[model samples]
Target: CVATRNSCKPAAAACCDPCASCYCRFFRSACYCRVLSLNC
Candidate 1:
């Protein structure tokens, strides 16, 4: 249940809610992102 920037953005935008286990790592600008259990 992991999502990256591409998928995360849409999910967040659709619900306007934050993820419970959302975490972003540094790996170049806008290169790395992740969301855990993103079922909203």
Candidate 2:
């Protein structure tokens, strides 16, 4: 699923340690997004 800004940050941080399928993208400094793999 997709989420933005603060919603993205926590999930990104949490997933980092496990090297999971979670990522973030920043667009024009106005939007930040996170994509997570639910199947994992």
Which predicted model would earn the best TM-score? 1
Candidate 1 per-residue lDDT, tens place, 1-40, comes to 2234442333434323255433445643343235466575
Q: What clash count goes with each model?
A: 0, 0
User: For this target, which candidate reaches the highest lDDT against the unseen true structure?
Assistant: 1
Tell me which residue pairs clash in candidate 1. none
What tens-digit string does per-residue lDDT give for candidate 2 at 1-40? 3323333344434323232433444453333333344443
Q: Candidate 1: lDDT of 39?
A: 77
TM-scores across all candidates? 0.21, 0.17
Model 2: CA > 4 A from native: 1-15, 28-35
Candidate 1: C-alpha RMSD to true structure equals 6.4
Worst 10 residues of 2 by lDDT: 14-23
